[PDB]
Design a protein around this ligand. Structure first.
Ligand SMILES: Nc1nc2c(ncn2[C@H]2C[C@H](O)[C@@H](COP(=O)(O)OP(=O)(O)OP(=O)(O)O)O2)c(=O)[nH]1
Ligand SMILES: [Ca+2]
Ligand SMILES: [Ca+2]
Length: 278
């Protein structure tokens, strides 16, 4: 019974509730009172839990949501893909976290992840998202975003606790936007490649994309390398030693000796791009 959960009762004091609908792999928040999409920073796009449960029924949404703000005391800890087919923790980093951070825990909508809600403050030196080799991930937010609420309590952790969160540094990577500006620009111009297909010459796709990187990044090799590692063409071969270097570095160096023109963001000579879009 979701309204008997103490954590739900605590969250029920706040008028920061939304409903959400499944769109592809995304979960879009919706204003629980008029059925339109909800901003995550507009307080009047939300409602209290009574308006959210009424809107859940009235529009047939997929579930409830709660918007975290920097003024409320709640921290949202998201553990992606940490459960097996029997809803038991299969990642040892997640099991260790649950042992050190005992607060309200619920199974996320996909059934293979967890949510942890704590009253506290995130440490200042950790990254928001941390990905692991087994596909699992740890995402932490305390504001600017909403969280789905399922009420499927995990191992009886039904109460939100006030806890110090400095131990989150044991699990999240530590910190010690122009790249995304270049990446999004290449996508708008149709210069962003898609994943290789079965019959493709992958290495030839690498050089086509590397040549386009040389223009849009202005022959900034370090920038070209950072962007390639988050492209659909990245693989282990990119870092395999090759002659005096790596296959990727030889690819990027070759692209600069080849490409003539260079994109200058202060001039925006997008027309100088020697390569047609994909
Ligand atoms: N504004 C906005 N928020 C989103 C969107 N998709 C997800 N969120 C929020 C709601 C989720 O609770 C939270 C974490 O995202 P996830 O992909 O991990 O979904 P969630 O944990 O709810 O379920 P799941 O991991 O699939 O079991 O981010 C979106 O497309 N737009
Ligand atoms: Ca999740
Ligand atoms: Ca908060």
């Amino acid at each position: 019974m979701i309204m008997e959960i103490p954590a739900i009762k605590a969250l029920s004091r706040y008028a920061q509730w939304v409903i959400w609908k499944k769109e592809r792999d995304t979960k879009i928040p919706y204003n629980p009172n008029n059925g339109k999409k909800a901003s995550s920073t507009d307080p009047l796009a939300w409602g209290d839990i009574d308006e959210a449960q009424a809107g859940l029924v009235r529009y047939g949404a997929n579930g409830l949501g709660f918007v975290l703000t920097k003024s409320d005391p709640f921290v949202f800890i998201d553990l992606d893909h940490v459960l097996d087919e029997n809803k038991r923790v299969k990642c040892e980093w997640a099991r260790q976290l649950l042992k050190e951070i005992k607060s309200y825990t619920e199974i996320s909508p996909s059934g293979d992840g967890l949510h942890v809600v704590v009253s506290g403050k995130l440490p200042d030196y950790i990254k928001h998202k941390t990905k692991f080799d087994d596909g699992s991930a740890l995402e932490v937010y305390e504001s600017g975003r909403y969280m789905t609420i399922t009420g499927e309590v995990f191992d009886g952790r039904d109460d939100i606790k006030e806890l110090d969160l400095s131990i989150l540094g044991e699990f999240a990577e530590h910190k010690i936007l122009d790249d995304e500006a270049i990446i999004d620009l290449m996508k708008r111009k149709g210069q962003w490649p898609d994943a290789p297909k079965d019959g493709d010459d992958w290495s030839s796709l690498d050089m086509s994309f590397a040549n386009r990187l040389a223009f849009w990044c202005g022959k900034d090799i370090e920038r070209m390398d950072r962007i390639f590692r988050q492209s659909p063409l990245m693989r282990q071969k990119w870092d395999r030693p090759t002659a005096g270097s790596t296959y990727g570095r030889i690819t990027l160096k070759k692209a600069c000796d080849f490409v003539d023109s260079v994109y200058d963001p202060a001039l925006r000579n997008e027309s100088d791009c020697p390569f047609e879009p994909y």
